[PDB]
Amino acid sequence: PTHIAICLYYKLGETPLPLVIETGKDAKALQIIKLAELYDIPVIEDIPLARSLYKNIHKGQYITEDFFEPVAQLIRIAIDLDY
Amino acid sequence: IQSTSLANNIKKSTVIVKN
């Protein structure tokens, strides 16, 4: 973790809460960001949020309460970004 | 292979957060 990337997924009635589906540090983080550009997936920079998610919510885990509001804000941004 | 499997996973993502 010079570089961190956290991939969040939310789909109604499927994921009960936002789900971390993938994470990466360093080269893998860089690759995730490059793949995001290729697939036009919204990417948002937030240093303390990225660190906290990386430390606390592992791949395949749902976010916990302390993350509800910041992640909810990210998802509201994302779903209309660059339309 | 990682890259093609990472892509196949990643591509459904709603949002990616980075530092």
Side-chain angles (χ1 to χ4, degrees):
Chain A
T2 294
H3 301 291
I4 296 175
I6 307 299
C7 300
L8 286 158
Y9 178 62
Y10 180 76
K11 162 68 81 146
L12 55 12
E14 172 194 0
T15 55
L17 290 167
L19 177 61
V20 173
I21 59 169
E22 190 68 75
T23 68
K25 61 178 178 68
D26 297 346
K28 183 176 179 196
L30 295 179
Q31 183 177 22
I32 289 167
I33 298 161
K34 293 174 170 176
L35 286 165
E37 186 63 28
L38 276 192
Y39 282 98
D40 189 31
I41 302 166
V43 175
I44 299 175
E45 192 178 313
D46 187 330
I47 294 172
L49 182 59
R51 181 162 62 254
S52 187
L53 284 163
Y54 188 87
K55 283 187 189 191
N56 291 287
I57 314 296
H58 306 142
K59 182 181 184 175
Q61 298 193 306
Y62 295 110
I63 62 168
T64 52
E65 284 163 31
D66 43 317
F67 296 102
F68 280 10
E69 66 192 331
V71 173
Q73 174 170 228
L74 291 175
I75 289 171
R76 218 316 297 196
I77 287 167
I79 60 172
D80 292 304
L81 195 75
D82 290 326
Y83 273 98
Chain B
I1 288 196
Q2 269 170 59
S3 68
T4 53
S5 43
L6 177 58
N8 273 345
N9 194 20
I10 264 193
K11 67 197 167 199
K12 69 186 187 176
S13 293
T14 306
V15 62
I16 293 166
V17 189
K18 60 176 185 175
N19 72 341

